[PDB]
């Protein structure tokens, strides 16, 4: 009952960021604060449009901004970061609780070499606002025309004509 407009494979050929889960888990808080703007815009497109096929470009901006975050970390604090994510990776559950000392090296490194401050607790969980210039999708669900309401019940009530009108019951 129609077609499916799958995007061009070329559109799905953006740079694919390559870091292991522990590397991302180590960056976490610092990544969230210094890369929120493209992140929030992309997901707002995801929630509003409800269609990734309409939000690839916003996904691309996330990858580019993710690269710049990781490009800066190698240029300045490659060693302490390499020490940190290795310490996270050893744990089977990847807990920050066991690598406080390596974290202490990492955050002070980016603080005095890249001007980054670790967000406080719950700060990364706040609800943010963005100024995306795309229009709000009028019909995100592509809803069909809503049915017309049934004839409204109104008018005044008067005594039933000739009573019950059932057999020999005059009234």
């Amino acid at each position: 009952p129609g077609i499916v407009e799958l995007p061009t494979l070329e559109d799905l050929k953006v740079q694919e960021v390559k870091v292991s889960s522990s590397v991302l888990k180590a960056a976490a808080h610092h990544y969230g604060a210094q890369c929120d703007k493209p992140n929030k815009e992309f997901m707002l497109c995801r929630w509003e449009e409800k269609d990734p096929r309409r939000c690839l470009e916003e996904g691309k901006l996330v990858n580019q901004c993710a690269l710049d975050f990781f490009r800066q970390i190698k240029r300045h604090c490659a060693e302490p970061f390499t020490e940190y994510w290795t310490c996270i990776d050893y744990s089977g559950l990847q807990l920050f609780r066991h690598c406080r000392k390596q974290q202490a090296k990492f955050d002070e490194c980016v603080l005095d070499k890249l001007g980054w401050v670790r967000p406080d607790l719950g700060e990364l969980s706040k609800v943010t606002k963005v100024k995306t210039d795309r229009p709000l999708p009028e019909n995100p669900y592509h809803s069909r025309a809503r049915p017309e309401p049934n004839p409204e019940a109104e008018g005044d009530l008067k005594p039933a004509k000739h009573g019950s009108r059932l057999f020999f019951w005059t009234m």
Binding site: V4, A28, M43, R46, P52
Partner: protein
């Protein structure tokens, strides 16, 4: 002692979850590309696999709606390898 330690664990879990929220945009961003890539690969192969059929117009949306329906996992990995199927459907359940 249990009261204090449990509160500390709650604070740790908040930090754990906040860490998770940070990288959700990337995982969502990449996964949609992978899903669209998998569907696109399926569509091209479906066109090649059926060209002499009576009428199998490529990629007809069964649902009447024009909005995107979250795809079946079957239609994603359907023609892929056997190992891909098992690691996808019974991957998390079987990982003990």
């Amino acid at each position: 002692s249990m009261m204090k330690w449990n509160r500390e664990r709650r604070r740790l879990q908040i930090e754990d979850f906040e860490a998770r929220i940070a990288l959700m945009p990337l995982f969502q961003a990449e996964k949609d590309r992978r899903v669209l890539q998998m569907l696109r690969e399926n569509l091209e192969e479906e066109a090649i696999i059926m060209k002499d059929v009576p009428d199998w117009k490529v990629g007809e949306s069964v649902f009447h709606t024009t909005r995107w329906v979250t795809p079946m996992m079957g239609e994603l990995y359907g023609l892929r390898t056997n190992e891909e199927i098992l690691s996808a459907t019974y991957g998390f359940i079987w990982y003990t």
